[PDB]
Design a protein around this motif. Structure first.
Motif, PDB file in Angstrom:
ATOM      1  N   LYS A  25      20.792   3.228 129.143  1.00 40.34           N
ATOM      2  CA  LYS A  25      21.909   2.294 129.068  1.00 40.34           C
ATOM      3  C   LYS A  25      21.484   0.902 129.528  1.00 40.34           C
ATOM      4  CE  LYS A  25      26.261   3.308 130.732  1.00 40.34           C
ATOM      5  NZ  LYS A  25      27.532   4.072 130.873  1.00 40.34           N
ATOM      6  N   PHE A  26      22.149  -0.119 128.999  1.00 39.53           N
ATOM      7  CA  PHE A  26      21.842  -1.499 129.356  1.00 39.53           C
ATOM      8  C   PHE A  26      22.758  -1.990 130.472  1.00 39.53           C
ATOM      9  CE2 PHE A  26      20.770  -0.736 124.960  1.00 39.53           C
ATOM     10  CZ  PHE A  26      19.489  -1.240 124.850  1.00 39.53           C
ATOM     11  N   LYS A  27      22.166  -2.605 131.490  1.00 42.49           N
ATOM     12  CA  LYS A  27      22.927  -3.123 132.620  1.00 42.49           C
ATOM     13  C   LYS A  27      23.296  -4.586 132.404  1.00 42.49           C
ATOM     14  CE  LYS A  27      19.371  -1.981 134.811  1.00 42.49           C
ATOM     15  NZ  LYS A  27      17.934  -1.935 135.200  1.00 42.49           N
ATOM     16  N   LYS A  28      23.724  -4.911 131.189  1.00 40.93           N
ATOM     17  CA  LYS A  28      24.111  -6.276 130.851  1.00 40.93           C
ATOM     18  C   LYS A  28      25.281  -6.738 131.714  1.00 40.93           C
ATOM     19  CE  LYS A  28      23.292  -6.799 126.013  1.00 40.93           C
ATOM     20  NZ  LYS A  28      24.238  -6.973 124.877  1.00 40.93           N
TER      21      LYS A  28
END
Length: 11
Positions: free
Chosen positions: A1-4
């Motif tokens: 998952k991306f921690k944007k």
């Protein structure tokens, strides 16, 4: 998952 950044939603 991306921690944007969810700033777009916070704004």
């Amino acid at each position: 998952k991306f921690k944007k950044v969810i700033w777009k939603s916070f704004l």
